[PDB]
Amino acid sequence: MEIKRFGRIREVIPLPPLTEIQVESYRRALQADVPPEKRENVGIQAAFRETFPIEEEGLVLDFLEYRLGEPPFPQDECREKDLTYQAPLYARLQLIHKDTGLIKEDEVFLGHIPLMTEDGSFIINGADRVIVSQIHRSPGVYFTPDPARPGRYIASIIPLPKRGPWIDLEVEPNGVVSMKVNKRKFPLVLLLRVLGYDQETLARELGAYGELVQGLMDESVFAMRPEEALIRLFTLLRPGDPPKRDKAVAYVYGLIADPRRYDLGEAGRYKAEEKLGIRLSGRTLARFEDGEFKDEVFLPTLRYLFALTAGVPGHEVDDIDHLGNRRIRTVGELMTDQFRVGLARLARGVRERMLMGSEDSLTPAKLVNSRPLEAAIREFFSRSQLSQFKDETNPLSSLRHKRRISALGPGGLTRERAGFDVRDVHRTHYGRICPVETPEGANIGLITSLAAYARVDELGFIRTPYRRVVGGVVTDEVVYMTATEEDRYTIAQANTPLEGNRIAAERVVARRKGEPVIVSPEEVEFMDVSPKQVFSVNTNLIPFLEHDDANRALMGSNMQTQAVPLIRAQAPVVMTGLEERVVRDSLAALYAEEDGEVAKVDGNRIVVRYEDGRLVEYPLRRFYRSNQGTALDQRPRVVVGQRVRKGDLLADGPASENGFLALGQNVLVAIMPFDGYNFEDAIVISEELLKRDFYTSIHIERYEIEARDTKLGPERITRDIPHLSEAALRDLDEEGVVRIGAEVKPGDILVGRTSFKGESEPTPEERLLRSIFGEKARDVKDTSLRVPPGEGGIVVRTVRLRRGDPGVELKPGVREVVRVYVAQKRKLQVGDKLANRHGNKGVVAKILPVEDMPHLPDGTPVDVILNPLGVPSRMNLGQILETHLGLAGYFLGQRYISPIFDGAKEPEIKELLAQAFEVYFGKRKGEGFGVDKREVEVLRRAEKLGLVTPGKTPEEQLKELFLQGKVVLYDGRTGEPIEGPIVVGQMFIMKLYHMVEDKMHARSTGPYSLITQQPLGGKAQFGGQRFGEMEVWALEAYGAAHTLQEMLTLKSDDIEGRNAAYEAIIKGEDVPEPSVPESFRVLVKELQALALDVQTLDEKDNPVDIFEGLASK
Amino acid sequence: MVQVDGGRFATSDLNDLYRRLINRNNRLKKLLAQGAPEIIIRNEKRMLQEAVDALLDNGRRGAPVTNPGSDRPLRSLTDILSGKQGRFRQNLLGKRVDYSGRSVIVVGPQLKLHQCGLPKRMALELFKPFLLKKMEEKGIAPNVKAARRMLERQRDIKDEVWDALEEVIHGKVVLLNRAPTLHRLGIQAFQPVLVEGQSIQLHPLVCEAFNADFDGDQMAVHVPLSSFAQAEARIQMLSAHNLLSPASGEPLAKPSRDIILGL
């Protein structure tokens, strides 16, 4: 099956590594392989140099270097034993006595640091996890207008999150400028006096703008000493606090001048220098040296504010949603932030431990307590919002999860308090953030995806590539630039016609600061690399995207994450061209490292003899259970003795076919109504799909049980369960566990366990019952693990962990834990969900035998019937064009690649259909068959509808219908043709994760809540359904008084009523009258706890007791 | 303060709030007996007043009291009774109920207006108390207790149980519900028909009132129990009896989509 390619745009560069946002950022933070003497001042190295040295203020603790050891256990062991994949961390410290001058050095153990796997994920407590990047406002200096009063601007200074307070500079109506710290407003002139400023300096610098300087020339504070002004300022900032200089200088310095408390950041310092046109020595607002405060940024900030009010051309306001003012915090930065917090707590403990206890004899090991550091690190990787359970339904699911960008999390926005401005598509998202891929609902516009060609720079800004244009000819030089730099150029579109490397069109469509314009070729400076850089990876996999509505394209890209791997999965007939790269970059398949010859091929291993002579053996992952329950396996694709080049495929991973992404099946589709079984997005399928094992998936479920120690006695895992027959114990081995390979159904026992019953008084009735039968009671009861209702399958694995095993860290009192794995093969059934890449989705409502399906005149039946009523309202025409190209490839036996926005067109599709007709109809003529009688009748109506040209031969008219994608279709039930030609073709359809077998649930009676005594909720808890407020309103409007009273009392919380109702039904009687619900009794008691007297009365106002005298003294 | 399936204990936040008040009340008694100065006594009295406030309404005045090792405020008596998660709106105006189920819905074109499709497995659990009596009446089981033990294991269920289930539901109706329930037409009564499968079958003509389609929607099932409840559902809530809109009086069950296209 050959592949035909469409398109005209020649891409100069390939796609970058798709996981480099995760992998590269964590490498920079750890710096594990660079020698210590050559390490840069980034990552955890910068954290060490910030907290250290620690001075008592004569004991000094100094930092020299650090190192990371080998992980104690491999990745596979951590998953099985519920461990964390991590590496030990050691620090080399020295202690210096300022008095004596003696130095002692030793290496202290600081703890463990979780390690990132090769694919870019973490293993935390045996579970795979992904750290999601965060987007937030960049630090710097910004200028926005005042909304309350026109003509006024406000200057803001923003530090890094949790690294200092915000500073606001505003001109008051009286003309005096104010500075606001920690919700307290105070005059900026007072602060400037502390910074050693004179009126002559202020007048010289800021006196050439207007009347604004008049408000900065007070004279009561000016003549005051800066130290006297410092103590006055401290009184305002800290009301009530006694005014001591040691308490005052330690507060002003720590507010704006302390590098350990205030940090502008590398991004914030760079932005401030670019905007204000200055050079900052550090990352603080002011520097404190020689017992005096020196200004760094306040004066340039105030100069810009005064000039902006005047109206000088070089000053402008700032757009906070501009992507040049927003940055990305990656996993490396997020972990380092928590690392610094834990390191700060360690220094606090060291300082207090060196001022008490064995002052003369101290060592760095004794002073250092690393527990606060380990606690902060483990909290980030476990209980953080940005640390998320990994999504690995298919290989594409995990690739998307690592490229997602979130505005939520600590220091971010709130889902309920987010406005419309933050959720909108900005003009600067072009080429950096995908405009369509987002979740509809309360998270819309807050969680997004990175574009295909985009990449995050060192400062955290997203950049996109462009091609340099000089003199009207396009070059091969590619420049990556940020949004702020992009606004200075005219950038043309990638679809501009070119004759070689020179622009041929006289009129060029381009962008200027985001707006579309028409320019001459001589005015073009840059060009787009490809249309693919505008969208993300998921959106780039949708062919004919330009014919689909944006709302429906959102569903198509999102639902590809939920597709399940299939045992006979195949690549789509029509592709876009990214299928091969997705599989390669997911690290799910296996490729040859270099040229060589395959020596051994097996279902479990592959051995390759490389040219240099070394032997490498690759173990294959077989029947492994993912986080979502889908089965992940690797199938070898080579034979013994086969020669392989570098990069050749060795084994296919899940949802892949010969190295191509394969999320579904290719099926024959007819677009027509069918007897109301296509009603409202329903789908009709053929039984022939089940016969060839199409849409069949494998799933694995895990069950767990524990044996503990109790005061009454120890729980035992055993085969000798009391009062059990031999039939129920047939499949258990001698140890009490189910044997491997046994089929289990609901109610079957997986592992047997006994418990000590304890002390109790046998009812008098049971006393007589046991005396008549002469049966002595036992001291143990049945507490075994059984299959939940609606489940079951085949036992494939049993895992047993015991106390004292190497690497097994059980909780106290736990003796052993047993895990059982059950696997099932799921075929397609009624209620399962199907979808295609264009957003069309539905559930299977009918399965028909082969003789009932519509068939072609040659006898070939269709597989799927789709309702045409779903197309016109959704405006997703891409599925129609895909069906047309699928029909041509069905008879020509070829596949196609059509890139988005540059690919196959109708003139090219119709010429392929002309060749497919010559084999669809030319074969019939050779066999000795003409035109069917039924085909003649349909052609007679076809010209009445204006579909074919009158006067032509029947063969010519049939070719006209074929070029429109329509064929004559026969009814399988009657044998008569459909009265009109029907669109028939080949389409790619995926099977989704949502299945009816995992959602059906029912309950008659079950567990109840502790306080309210109402039924629990959830299928896993065997709970009941919630009858909410709006459901109660519906019964009231119907007038069904007795039906409503049943649900409120007899079926929820009337304990006496629910016991009596059950006993009445099993005796063939009618249910009794309901009583007072238990929830009302709880409300009365809770109101009494608030010292409120609530009493129920009667017609004569006499008190009525609703507690049956159980609470009356 | 209850033990759980394991060995650890679980307790409510009210116990901590009661402990704080007792500890400070007892310390004030000892301080008064020792003749402490007024400065020490006044601090204790101020702390006692604040402890009473936290028990009654935490966070109303001052910083809320939080448990050590966390920043989560403790739930007080006022928080229990007020809000969307309070006692009124969560436990008194709405409840979870028994004899209820949920599953995915598909279209049934062969059903009558007053019929729906109920899976057999769901119906076995929904009508379990009625089925146990029926099996005892026939020779399937000797008593109700033995009848219940047969249904516990799937492989122990004979073919005669399904025949008895048909007799149990003869003439009865169930309630179908789809969220959100914007109007009273979001709950309707149908006469169930037992079907093979795991999905509920819905009549095409009632989809508009439910605002339900077939791209993944689920529904809930409820069983009225008494004769009064059955009579109200069969007379006032039957789908075939509610054909006009209560808001405007125009027809609400009417041809739509393929039905209009064909005619």
């Binding site: 009301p239 009530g240 006694p242 | 601090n43 101020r46 702390m47 604040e50 001052g62």
Partner: peptide, 15 residues
């Protein structure tokens, strides 16, 4: 003011 019980106590003992 008076929102911090700790600050209130420190002021009293300082007299």
């Amino acid at each position: 003011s008076t929102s911090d019980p700790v600050r209130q106590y420190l002021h009293e003992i300082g007299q």
